[PDB]
Amino acid sequence: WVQPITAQKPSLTLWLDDKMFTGLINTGADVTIIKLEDWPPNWPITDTLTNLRGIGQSNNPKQSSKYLTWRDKENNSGLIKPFVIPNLPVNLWGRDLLSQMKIMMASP
Amino acid sequence: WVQPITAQKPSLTLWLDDKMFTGLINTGADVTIIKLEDWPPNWPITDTLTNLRGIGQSNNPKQSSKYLTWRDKENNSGLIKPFVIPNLPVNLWGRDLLSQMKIMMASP
Amino acid sequence: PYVFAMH
């Protein structure tokens, strides 16, 4: 597939284990973040030592206890262990995921 | 040009007006942000009433008073008005700039 | 505007 970068949010819809998620393509972070409001309550999460550096403020996220199988619409797949944080407006697909999908950025 | 998305920071070096800057390609950012530490002291900045939102929130950040001419190594060019913020680890190229460079995201 | 470089 091909998607231009415009002023609109670059979005991607995929499955993590058995549930469909939509998120924002975020090349700025090497990690993936799922909003707590979208996280299935029966999926275990754990405390981490990672600090996500924000806009003049650092948040300490939970992280998925298990690796999750991601799968896209073309049936490519792999594994990621996303972080889980409240009060985020959208899920954020980071470069850990984007690199497994072998996404390129190209210009004419 | 083509740049794969990997675990390493996807980087871009450009001129803004007459100065060279390196920054992180961040499809997750709506706007471009230059580090205060890198901002030439004679370039005017102005107050804004906007709010930058992500992991936390930065209220009324400063912004370049003037539009800046961006230019890449192939002499493509355009205009951008970045925000200027202290305590940022890297300059951030946002979609306001990336959309002017006609960048696509693609998978094999 | 929204700004997602956390790590």
Side-chain angles (χ1 to χ4, degrees), chain A residues 1-52 54-108, chain B, chain C:
Chain A
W1 56 261
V2 150
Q3 189 175 149
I5 295 168
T6 70
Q8 304 282 276
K9 306 193 127 167
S11 69
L12 205 52
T13 298
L14 58 112
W15 291 271
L16 305 176
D17 285 352
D18 69 315
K19 296 300 185 165
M20 169 176 292
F21 297 77
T22 297
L24 164 59
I25 297 166
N26 182 220
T27 63
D30 66 1
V31 298
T32 291
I33 314 291
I34 300 294
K35 56 202 232 186
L36 180 63
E37 298 80 8
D38 284 4
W39 184 258
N42 43 313
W43 290 8
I45 53 185
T46 183
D47 298 322
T48 77
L49 299 324
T50 321
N51 300 90
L52 302 186
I55 310 142
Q57 175 191 120
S58 273
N59 293 210
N60 170 222
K62 307 271 191 92
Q63 183 173 25
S64 177
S65 302
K66 300 281 285 186
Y67 288 92
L68 313 171
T69 298
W70 65 266
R71 184 177 330 265
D72 67 17
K73 300 272 193 149
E74 314 186 284
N75 202 40
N76 306 294
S77 63
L79 289 175
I80 39 73
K81 204 193 265 261
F83 297 92
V84 184
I85 192 89
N87 304 128
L88 205 65
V90 294
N91 301 316
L92 300 171
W93 306 131
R95 296 198 311 279
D96 57 342
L97 176 65
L98 301 171
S99 64
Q100 302 187 25
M101 306 171 147
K102 300 187 165 194
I103 294 158
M104 315 292 299
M105 286 176 304
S107 187
Chain B
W1 55 261
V2 190
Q3 191 175 150
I5 294 168
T6 68
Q8 306 286 280
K9 303 194 144 168
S11 206
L12 201 51
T13 298
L14 317 167
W15 290 272
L16 301 178
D17 285 350
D18 67 312
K19 293 298 196 318
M20 172 174 292
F21 298 78
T22 296
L24 163 62
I25 296 167
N26 189 358
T27 63
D30 291 342
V31 299
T32 291
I33 311 179
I34 300 296
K35 299 152 61 175
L36 181 68
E37 298 80 10
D38 284 5
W39 184 258
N42 47 314
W43 288 7
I45 52 185
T46 185
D47 302 322
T48 76
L49 281 210
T50 177
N51 314 89
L52 301 188
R53 307 194 190 106
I55 300 275
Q57 190 178 298
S58 176
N59 300 326
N60 322 120
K62 311 275 184 247
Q63 184 172 24
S64 177
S65 303
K66 303 294 185 183
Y67 286 89
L68 311 172
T69 297
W70 65 264
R71 185 175 327 262
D72 68 19
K73 307 275 210 162
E74 299 176 8
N75 201 41
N76 305 295
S77 63
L79 291 175
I80 192 73
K81 205 191 261 189
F83 295 86
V84 185
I85 292 180
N87 302 313
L88 204 69
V90 297
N91 301 316
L92 300 174
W93 306 130
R95 295 197 310 280
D96 57 346
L97 175 65
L98 300 172
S99 61
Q100 307 188 33
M101 304 170 146
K102 302 186 279 191
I103 295 158
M104 310 293 253
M105 287 175 306
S107 70
Chain C
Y2 288 101
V3 180
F4 291 120
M6 279 164 294
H7 196 269

